[PDB]
Amino acid sequence: ATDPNGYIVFCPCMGRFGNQVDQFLGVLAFAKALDRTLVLPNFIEFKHPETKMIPFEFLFQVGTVAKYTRVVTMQEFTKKIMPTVWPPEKRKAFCWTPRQAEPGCHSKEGNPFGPYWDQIDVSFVGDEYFGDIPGGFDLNQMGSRKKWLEKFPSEEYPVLAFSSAPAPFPSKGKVWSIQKYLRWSSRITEQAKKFISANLAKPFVAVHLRNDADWVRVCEHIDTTTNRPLFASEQCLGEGHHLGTLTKEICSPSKQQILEQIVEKVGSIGAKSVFVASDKDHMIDEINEALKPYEIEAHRQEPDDMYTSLAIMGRADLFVGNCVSTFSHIVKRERDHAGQSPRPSAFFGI
Amino acid sequence: ATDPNGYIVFCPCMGRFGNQVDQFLGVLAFAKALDRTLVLPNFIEFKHPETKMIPFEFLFQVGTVAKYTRVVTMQEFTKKIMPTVWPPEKRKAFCWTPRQAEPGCHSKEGNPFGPYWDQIDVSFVGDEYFGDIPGGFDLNQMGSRKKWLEKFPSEEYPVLAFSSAPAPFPSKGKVWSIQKYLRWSSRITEQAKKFISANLAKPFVAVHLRNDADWVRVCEHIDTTTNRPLFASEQCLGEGHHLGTLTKEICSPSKQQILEQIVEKVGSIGAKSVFVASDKDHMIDEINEALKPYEIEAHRQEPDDMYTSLAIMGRADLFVGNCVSTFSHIVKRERDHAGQSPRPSAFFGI
Ligand SMILES: C[C@@H]1O[C@H](OP(=O)(O)OP(=O)(O)OC[C@H]2O[C@@H](n3cnc4c(=O)[nH]c(N)nc43)[C@H](O)[C@@H]2O)[C@@H](O)[C@H](O)[C@@H]1O
Ligand SMILES: C[C@@H]1O[C@H](OP(=O)(O)OP(=O)(O)OC[C@H]2O[C@@H](n3cnc4c(=O)[nH]c(N)nc43)[C@H](O)[C@@H]2O)[C@@H](O)[C@H](O)[C@@H]1O
C-alpha cells in the first residue's frame, strides 16, 4: 500500500555534503513530528562539469535510518508511489512565503534547484506557503504539528515538496543525535576497514584539514566582536558560542599549529599512524617530517574520496577536526552518537 | 540627536506598488513593536528602462505616518544619521537564514535588490539571522520583542537592515487599519481634487480595471479546489477565504460583466459620472456606450498616473475594485480607515 499520512520530499539544495547532511538531520525530525514518510534525498556533488545527484542508499543504509522514522528511497517514490499518489497536476511546491523571482516559491530557479527536480522529472504547477503557521517548521518546542495537519490534510496534500530543506541551518543541538541513524553503506564501510587494515597501524589519529582558498576567505571574514555561529562552530563552542570566541586560528590553523597539535595528539595516545583527510593540502610530507621522532607516518587516500574519508575518521582512535566545518561535524556527531558511548574527538585551536 | 534604540531600514523588494505598500504596513507595525525608528522606504517603479526609486515623501505625508510610530526620511537617514551611527564597516544585512546564492543573505543579488541599496550607496560586509528567534517577525501575538532586543541590542546593532521587508505578504487583517496613516502628499491630493472638479460630476463611481496580459495569466491559474489566498483576495473573501471561493470571474471579470456591474452601481447611487483606473484597457468607449441610457460618461487620466488614480478612487462616492489586486486593496483600506467612518466599496464578481 502507501502511507495514508502522505509524504515529504525535499532538495538538500544548500551547500556541499556537510550542509546537506546537517539539514537532513532536521528534516528527519520534522517528518517524524508530522508523522509523514520521508522520501530519502539524493545528495548533491558539485566537483564535476555538472551537478551530480547521488542516491541516499549509495552512501547510507536505509535499514538504519528507518529505525528512526518511516522512509522510502527516491527510486521507490518515483517509480512506485509518485505516479498514482502525486500526479504532475498536483505537484505543488512548498515554501515559507511568496518571493521575488510572479511572486511564488520559484523551486527550479538556479542550481542545484533545477537539476535536482529535473533528475526526478518533477515540475511544479502551484505553490503552497507555511510561513503563516505559528512556529514554522520547528515542531518540538514551539510545537505546531496540529496546525500543519489542519492546513495540509493528507488527502488533499499527499506529498509535501520543499525546494529548500525544512530544517534549520546550522543544525540545532537537539537533532545532532539523529546522526546515530546514518550508518555508511556496506560498500563504504568495507573500503574504510580495508584502508585502515592496510595502512593505519593502531591506535591512529585522524585529522580533517580544511584548507582550500574559499575556506581561508571565509575564516578571514570572522567578526570576533559579534561572535555569531559560523557553520558548525557551535560543535566546539556551544550553542550561541557560550563557551568562547571563534577565532581565525580555530577556523584556519596555521601549518605550524597543525603540526604542533598533530604531534601533541600522537604523543598523548601513543599513536602508530596518522590519517589525513583534506579538501586540498594533505600536508603529507610536512606531517611526516614532524612525525620522524615517533617513527610513524601520515597517510591519505589517493584520490581523496570524501565519503570513505568521513567513514575512516569515524573509526579512528582519536579524531581531530575543524570546528567550523560541517564536514568535521559529521564525524564529531557519528563519533558522539553511533555507538553506546562517545569515541573521543578534539578540534584544532581548541 | 539620534534614536538610542536604533533604526530599521529595508527594501520593499517584492512586487509592484500594491505589494510594496502591503508589506510596508507590516513593517510599520514591526518597527513600532521593536521601538526602533523606521527609515521610510523608497518605493520602486518598474515601468521605465531601468528600475526607479521614489522617495516616500513624494507620495505620502511624513507628518501623518509619524503619528503611528517614529520615522525618518531616507534623505535624513543617509545624509545625517548613517555616516556616524552606521558606517560602511558595520553594515550587516539581516535575513531569516543563510541561503544558497557562500551561504548568506545575498542582499544585492538581482533586481530590485541591487539597484535599491546602490541608490543609497550601501553595501553589506556581514550577515545576521533572525530565523532562530521564537515567533519570527510576528511581534504581536507570538510576541518576541524581548528576544529581538536581547539578540540585537541597540549599541551593537544601531541599524537593522533587511533586504526583504520584515512583514508578511499578503498582509494580515490586523495591519490593514495602518492605512489610516498613509495620507497622499499635498501634490497628489491636489491633482486628485482638480481632476474630480473638472471631470467628475458627483456622486461618482470609481472602478479599478486590472486587465493586462500577465494578470489574465495569474487569474487563469486559480486552483478552485485548494482555494488559497491569492494576493489581496482576503479583502473580499475574509481571512483564509472563510466567506467563499475565489473564482476566475472575480479575479478577471469579462467585459460584459464589468459593464453590467458598472451600470448596476451607477443606477444604485444615481451616479453622475464614472472614473476608470486601468493598467491597460480603460474601456472608455464601451463603458460610454453602456452609460448612454443614463446620459453620463466614464473618464480617465491621460496618461494614467497610478498614484493620482489611487487618490481619486479613495475620494469616490463609490469604489468598485478588483478583489485580487493589492492595488485595489490600497483603496479599500483607505476607504475603510482614512476617516472616522468607512466610505463604501464593492468588488467585481462579489
Ligand atoms: C565556505 C563554506 O564551506 C562549507 O563547507 P564545510 O562546512 O567544510 O563542509 P561541506 O558542506 O561538506 O563543504 C565542504 C566540501 O568540500 C570538500 N571537502 C572538505 N573536506 C574534505 C575532505 O577532507 N576530503 C575530501 N575529499 N573533500 C573534502 C567536500 O566536497 C565537502 O563536501 C560549505 O558547505 C558552505 O556552503 C561554504 O562553501
Ligand atoms: C501578477 C501579480 O500582480 C500584482 O499586482 P497587483 O496586486 O494588482 O498590484 P501592484 O503590486 O500594484 O502591481 C500592479 C501594478 O500595475 C500597474 N497598475 C495596476 N493598476 C493600475 C491602474 O489602475 N493604473 C495605473 N496607472 N497602473 C496600474 C501599477 O504599476 C501597479 O503598481 C503584482 O504586484 C504581483 O507582483 C504580480 O505581478
Short mmCIF file of C-alpha atoms in Angstrom, two decimals, chain A residues 13-15 19 46 92 96-103 111-113 125 127-128 132 134-135 137 142 151-153 157 168-170 172 214 217-218 221 223 226 228 231, chain B residues 13-15 19 46 92 96-103 111-113 125 127-128 132 134-135 137 142 151-153 157 168-170 172 214 217-218 221 223 226 228 231:
data_model
loop_
_atom_site.label_atom_id
_atom_site.label_comp_id
_atom_site.label_asym_id
_atom_site.label_seq_id
_atom_site.Cartn_x
_atom_site.Cartn_y
_atom_site.Cartn_z
CA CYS A 13 19.64 22.44 -2.00
CA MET A 14 22.04 24.39 0.20
CA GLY A 15 25.77 23.83 0.31
CA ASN A 19 25.49 21.30 4.79
CA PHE A 46 29.49 19.84 -7.27
CA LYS A 92 2.70 21.89 -5.53
CA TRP A 96 7.81 29.98 3.60
CA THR A 97 6.35 32.93 1.67
CA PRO A 98 5.86 34.12 -1.92
CA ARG A 99 9.15 35.61 -3.15
CA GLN A 100 10.57 37.86 -5.84
CA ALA A 101 11.90 35.70 -8.73
CA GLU A 102 5.02 36.24 -10.39
CA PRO A 103 5.70 36.01 -6.61
CA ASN A 111 21.39 25.46 -9.43
CA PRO A 112 21.13 22.91 -7.87
CA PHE A 113 17.39 23.69 -7.63
CA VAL A 125 2.17 23.67 -11.12
CA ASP A 127 2.58 26.98 -4.65
CA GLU A 128 1.73 26.44 -1.01
CA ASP A 132 1.72 31.75 8.37
CA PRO A 134 2.69 29.55 14.25
CA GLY A 135 6.17 28.14 14.89
CA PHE A 137 8.90 24.00 10.83
CA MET A 142 7.04 25.78 19.50
CA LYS A 151 -3.63 23.28 6.99
CA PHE A 152 -2.31 20.38 4.85
CA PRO A 153 -4.59 17.31 5.31
CA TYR A 157 -1.80 17.09 0.18
CA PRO A 168 17.41 24.99 10.39
CA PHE A 169 20.92 25.65 9.20
CA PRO A 170 23.20 25.32 11.00
CA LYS A 172 20.34 22.76 16.43
CA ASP A 214 37.41 29.65 -0.43
CA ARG A 217 38.44 33.58 2.69
CA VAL A 218 35.52 32.51 4.92
CA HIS A 221 35.90 37.36 7.41
CA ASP A 223 33.92 39.26 13.09
CA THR A 226 29.72 39.82 17.14
CA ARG A 228 27.98 34.59 15.92
CA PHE A 231 28.60 26.93 10.00
CA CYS B 13 11.85 44.45 -2.72
CA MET B 14 8.84 42.33 -3.67
CA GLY B 15 6.34 43.24 -6.35
CA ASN B 19 2.82 44.69 -2.89
CA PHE B 46 9.41 49.16 -12.88
CA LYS B 92 25.19 43.97 8.29
CA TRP B 96 15.81 34.66 8.08
CA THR B 97 18.52 32.07 7.40
CA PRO B 98 21.71 31.65 5.35
CA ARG B 99 20.74 30.83 1.76
CA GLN B 100 22.15 29.38 -1.45
CA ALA B 101 23.30 32.25 -3.73
CA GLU B 102 28.98 31.37 0.44
CA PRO B 103 25.62 30.83 2.24
CA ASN B 111 16.77 43.34 -9.20
CA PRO B 112 15.46 45.44 -7.50
CA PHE B 113 17.73 44.24 -4.65
CA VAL B 125 30.01 43.42 4.95
CA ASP B 127 25.13 38.83 7.80
CA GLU B 128 22.82 38.46 10.76
CA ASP B 132 16.17 31.26 15.24
CA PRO B 134 10.81 32.20 18.51
CA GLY B 135 7.97 33.79 16.53
CA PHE B 137 8.93 38.99 12.90
CA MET B 142 3.63 35.16 19.16
CA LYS B 151 19.71 39.21 20.38
CA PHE B 152 20.23 42.63 18.72
CA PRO B 153 20.99 45.26 21.42
CA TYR B 157 23.14 46.90 16.23
CA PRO B 168 4.00 39.02 5.88
CA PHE B 169 2.78 39.01 2.32
CA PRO B 170 -0.09 39.18 1.72
CA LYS B 172 -2.72 40.17 7.75
CA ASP B 214 0.18 38.99 -17.01
CA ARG B 217 -2.45 34.59 -16.79
CA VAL B 218 -2.43 34.83 -12.98
CA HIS B 221 -4.08 29.62 -12.84
CA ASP B 223 -6.99 26.33 -8.32
CA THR B 226 -7.39 24.45 -2.78
CA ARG B 228 -5.91 29.61 -1.02
CA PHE B 231 -2.56 38.40 -3.38
#
